[PDB]
Design a protein around this nucleic acid. Sequence first.
DNA 1: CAACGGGCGGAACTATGCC
RNA 2: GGCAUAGUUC
Lengths: 255, 66, 95, 34, 528, 95, 44, 521, 115
Amino acid sequence: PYANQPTVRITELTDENVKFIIENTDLAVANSIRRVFIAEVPIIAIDWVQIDANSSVLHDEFIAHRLGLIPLTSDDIVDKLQYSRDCTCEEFCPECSVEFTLDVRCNEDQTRHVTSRDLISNSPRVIPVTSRDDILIVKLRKGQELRLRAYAKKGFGKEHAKWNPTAGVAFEYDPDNALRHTVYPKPEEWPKSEYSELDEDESQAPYDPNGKPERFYYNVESCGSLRPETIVLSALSGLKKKLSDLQTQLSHEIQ
Amino acid sequence: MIIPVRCFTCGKIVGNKWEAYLGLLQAEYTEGDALDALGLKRYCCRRMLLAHVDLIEKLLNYAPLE
Amino acid sequence: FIGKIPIMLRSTYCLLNGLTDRDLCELNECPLDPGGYFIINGSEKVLIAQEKMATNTVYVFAKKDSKYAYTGECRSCLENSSRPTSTIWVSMLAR
Amino acid sequence: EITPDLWQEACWIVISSYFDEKGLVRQQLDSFDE
Amino acid sequence: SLKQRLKGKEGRVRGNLMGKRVDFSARTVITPDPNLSIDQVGVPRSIAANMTFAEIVTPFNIDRLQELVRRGNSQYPGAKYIIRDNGDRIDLRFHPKPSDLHLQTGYKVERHMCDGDIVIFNRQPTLHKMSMMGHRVRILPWSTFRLNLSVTTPYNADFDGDEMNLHLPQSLETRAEIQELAMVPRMIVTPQSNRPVMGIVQDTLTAVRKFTKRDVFLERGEVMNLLMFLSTWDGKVPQPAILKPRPLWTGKQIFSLIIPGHINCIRTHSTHPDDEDSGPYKHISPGDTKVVVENGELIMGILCKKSLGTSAGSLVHISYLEMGHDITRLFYSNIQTVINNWLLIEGHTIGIGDSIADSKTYQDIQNTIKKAKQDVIEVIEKAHNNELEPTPGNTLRQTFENQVNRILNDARDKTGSSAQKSLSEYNNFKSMVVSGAKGSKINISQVIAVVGQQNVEGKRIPFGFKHRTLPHFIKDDYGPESRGFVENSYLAGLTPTEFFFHAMGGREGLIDTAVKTAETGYIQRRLI
Amino acid sequence: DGLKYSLATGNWGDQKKAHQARAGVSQVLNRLTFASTLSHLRRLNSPIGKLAKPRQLHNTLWGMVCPAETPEGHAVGLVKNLALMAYISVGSQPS
Amino acid sequence: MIYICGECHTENEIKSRDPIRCRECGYRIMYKKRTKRLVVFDAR
Amino acid sequence: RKLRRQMDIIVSEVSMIRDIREREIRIYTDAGRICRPLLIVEKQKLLLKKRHIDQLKEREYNNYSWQDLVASGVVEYIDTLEEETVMLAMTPDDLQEKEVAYCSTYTHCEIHPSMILGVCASIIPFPDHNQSPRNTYQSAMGKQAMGVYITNFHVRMDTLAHVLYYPQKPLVTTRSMEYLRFRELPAGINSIVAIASYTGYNQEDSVIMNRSAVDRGFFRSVFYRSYKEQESQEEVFEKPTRETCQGMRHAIYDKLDDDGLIAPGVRVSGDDVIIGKTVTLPTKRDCSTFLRTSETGIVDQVMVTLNQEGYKFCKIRVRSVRIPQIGDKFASRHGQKGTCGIQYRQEDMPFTCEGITPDIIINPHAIPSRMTIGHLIECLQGKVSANKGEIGDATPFNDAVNVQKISNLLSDYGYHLRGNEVLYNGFTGRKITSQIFIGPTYYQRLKHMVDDKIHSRARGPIQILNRQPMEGRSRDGGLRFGEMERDCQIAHGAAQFLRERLFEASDPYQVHVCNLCGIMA
Amino acid sequence: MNAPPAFESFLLFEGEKKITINKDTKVPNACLFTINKEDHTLGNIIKSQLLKDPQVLFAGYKVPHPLEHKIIIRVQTTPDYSPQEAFTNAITDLISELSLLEERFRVAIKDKQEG
DNA sequence: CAACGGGCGGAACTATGCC
RNA sequence: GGCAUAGUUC
Ligand SMILES: [Mg+2]
Ligand SMILES: [Zn+2]
Ligand SMILES: [Zn+2]
Ligand SMILES: [Zn+2]
């Protein structure tokens, strides 16, 4: 009637990728962590645009939508910030948002590429990930002009998918089909998984009636906003705070 | 119209790869080799570059109002 | 001067006939526009090809329960001059 | 000088030349011109 | 003229007295929603806030109605008007003075439509009385008319751009009329053919067969979930069938909990042979056919279209006739929810692997086709040598055509039988055909083996050109290919002549569909 | 005014006699998609008013008229579209 | 009120009760200039 | 025939027919005959040669073209009633060759048999694996898809216009789309479609859409509408004032400028005033134009000019971005149409081993009865093409493209040959027992949305002659309660509901009558 | 037009309570917990943890409608044990497991980089 | 036997020309 | 405001 004793092993760790193996954990817990990677990890992204001049070939909502999807490095200040709905300011203060400014005009005979290199922020720690190519925003002819002011709030991927900090979360358990959770009409047509521990002749592991899914394999790839280790840690802390607040509310209700 | 910033299916950023992709193609690369070189690993990301039609080049031909 | 005749777009007597794509873009006209329509009071009109029975040929048909057994008509026209058609029938009474 | 089993490109070269010469709305233009 | 004013449709009598435009009506797109009950309809918040119902003030509700008036026309659970006893109207869409907001018994408040309101839902054309039934309103976020899926059959409605009409009765008298007369659960069994007019539709129906196979053993947690989705559940988990070495339930053991009351029924699965009922194993049924329900428990058998469908004497029909509309409604809802949430575990699909046959089957099909073409050639040779003898009552052309068509039909049917009997136990075409969800053995045959002969006006493809079908054939060619017998299946593809002949064949179906409708409507109007 | 009116309304004839004038020529160009524009510019019409014969797909439409593209409803088989390589003669004189 | 000419792209003042003509190019199609009022776009 | 082939005396347009049995020669110079080009076969060998092919493939900087091919006597124009005296061959290198002799006197040959299809039916991939009604339905629905309809849409004031954000050219395309320019102005997006029954919201031709994909710009579009008004008493463009004009409404006039026109970039909600115009009543009457109810668009462009006569003229355009909701209509290139049923986020959609959630989920019951196997083959070919890097060829009659070849090609990239893939459940994380068929198919967003179709009424405007509710969603009209509906209510027996629908809900009235003569008094 | 704002799926509004406790009168020692603004991310963990308890006889959860954000959990336990105690113990055990997992992942990161 | 007259689906949504 | 015509959905 007690908790488990999970263990981890990090197979590969780079600047955009973490591969690890969780063991001695329940499938529900593993999948809940997998879901929290995608949805409930706070990220800084642009959420308020005011276009002073737009003589380009894309309309204002098009440009604003493109601006929203440029990822900003929120490695360290995403914890410090507050939600704009949770702040004492009127609309925006430095404690709950980061302000951006873009002002580009083309006066040459060559098409100019307005990229994320041109977004300028007041805080030096929240900058587009392509500022230590570039994310193209719009192209300008001669005489066309763009100028705007934007504000970067804080949020997570349940609200909008621009706050989703990951690129592809590969989740897989039981690479050899020893638990028969999926049934193959022909087992020999199916390619073996990357983590399979079988020979070149045997296709499926023999059935294991007294087994449960353990040893989940992950691969969390980051979209550049957070680094792929803080995505995992923020998910374990982020899920842990959801359970704690549930326990607080239950204790009030019982009493 | 213009290449999207993110891949629709998974969210990997493909909005900074169109110029590099065109340059690789101009440098005598096959499309498969160019996509492999740019790091587009899964077909959801690969189709974003394979099937893109860049109309903003055509839209830039017409003179602006001002 | 006896009147004004509408002109079909991209035809030999339009202002866009023979122009290159750069000139078309200068005139704010799409180089991909196929043409072949009229501009009447702003709106764009398209004539629809209308099928008709071939003229100057003898066709022999039959009618279900009419007086005649077999009929034959020759819808006759003269080189698109005038007198549009004159369908002469040479029938044959039933038995 | 036959074109054997290389036909799947020859036929489409011919068709491309056709559509480069004429187009798709040639009927309307030719009828109005005449 | 006045006679023209009164003459026909759009004319006064028949266009403004026998049928006229009404108030309190809405029309928008319908989309599926398997989480609703049989007699519920999902309504967007905009339509509800736009349509109103007049409620008379009494001491039982004066506080609630006063709060609604305080909310006003802006907030959705509000009201739009206050109608005095004298009849004079008070507006609430703008800001009124505090004096008019006073409410006393005998007043009327025109509140916005809320949950539980009774409405009449219709899809045009209205053919039988199961096209206008009463539903209970539930308010849902987005802007389409959500409605359940078993109610698709009464309306003949699929969810591809369709629309339906909403009518809101305005008086307690008519509301009670619709509640006691035209509610959806009360129209389950039609008086046209004394059969249930609605049944399980194709997705719970393609999955209840798989659920009710013998192999389905359910773990403890899966049983917990499925029971969590049961609305008519006592609260006691039944003893598992397999008790050692691991507790396992069974799909029948849970469909028994779904089945209401003490219903006794005996049906037969759609793949039940003609020897089980005769030889031994009559009551043992090796293939698990011969559905038996005793005391409301599914003892044996596999459930399909012939048990849960819209046919006479089916399980749903027995449930209605024995228990009533109020229990048959729960029967439908529970079947749908439990089977859908189990299907989230098993899954379903359809693909090329399900539409591809085996090499031996391909050899059989090609052999049969070659034999049929040879036989047609032989018949043509005998006819040319004048050795063919006419059949009494038929012309020489008629007997030749009859022999040719008979040979080709035999070929098509034999290839179809080979394709059917060469399927597998995991094939999804077989899954959707055996359970009766959607498709047929002829469709499987056309996908795998042979599309078959194309006919125009009941005869073979005619001679459009001078004595030949197309410019690619010689004159006077009566072979199977010349007159349009497609030897290929849809998976292999059609050669250009077969493509054109198939288009000629499908044009007739499109024409008949576009033609029959007006005549059918006119016949029904004359009868009425 | 005569040419402008006939092209604007579609009633092919004089304004005073728009009763027997055949309506349905000179439609307003479809601009929803480029394919819509092209298939509108290459379109035929059979002036037949319910008989199946003029609505069926005759054998002689091979390579001249699309076997598939047709509207559904009250004009199934009466509105047709040219095949891809089909051409329509412009006319000459047999001198 | 300032309207931008559709041919020479030159803005010129035109008031009410005034033929819509363009100086120095003689065109007849004029476009209104973009407003100075500020409008806020979510970046969704 | 020799003279027509040389193009010396008889133009290539003229047709010549010999009726051998009836001894008649018919020559037509008429206008209106319909004809198509055909290759010429002299003995058994095409007159088209490799020299012609090379001179054609060097077409640039060589002034050798189709006219120079026709003038060489290689191809020919054949009208319909000259086709009755000709022997055609569908494919040269297959029908001219030595066989068991069917015909050894071929007189012509087909260029390619796939040129029998029109403009809208040349975009269907693998049409020979489909069903003819499905091909017809796709031919119908190809004129309703939303993409960029013309490149100069920014200077066109068209009454209604719809343009997609990010169109894509198909990954599986027909060879004859290069002539239709579908590569340059496409209409649709390649979507990762999984054919599965997930939660029951795609039953009966419905579609489950990924909401996270939609948040990234998937199938998003714009809607442009144009309004016009001219000042034909004395109508004048001017800003009305509440306490000086006779006619007035409950709308806002504070958006307008001095001359009565909204400047571009001004957000206008439903039931606002765009153009303010006033009639001097012989003291001023308001005839302002109002936004069509519930648009919530932004003014895009305002054009001021003079009409034919000389009155001032104005056209104003309004744009509104349309994000795909749960009522919008989508369709593939195989006659499979459906409406969005519900939208799930990325965390809820089922995923593969590699984190590839489908963009669209469609029901497996749509396939067996409709027999659109071109859909499955297009999905498989797209899954091969997106990995290989090429763009698949789906021209109708090929003989060099088989399902077996496609499957073998797909097996070389690590996937199951027949296209299936093991998916995991989204909510619970457990493997789904049945493997799902998933791959990139080319989908279209049809013109039919739900925001342009939702309509309701409760005591609105009323007609003048009959005093019944108006007709038309734009006029807040009611829904007709026809004779079939009243017959259904008669069959029900709901007499009071029927009387309410036909009398009280519609026009009620009262009159007086004399008890002696039945005449209104 | 009828589009709910995105934040309504996780933000409690004025008046809404996070969790409400109701008893089940069909079977003794049964209780239903209704949680507002939650989904499978919490329902699945709580159910799977309740099933580990040997004194829990029933433990399930369901989402009554995907368009309305609300979670219902039903747990029945053996006598001399209450479902509220089972629920609280489940949450405590989940928190302990997550804390241990985070500690071990952090030490694994430390070992992997610079080690 | 011939001539004359009335009869021929149901809903719904856009657009354009004209009085 | 009304009359007419055209297209489209089911
Ligand atoms: Mg339908
Ligand atoms: Zn703040
Ligand atoms: Zn991707
Ligand atoms: Zn100018």
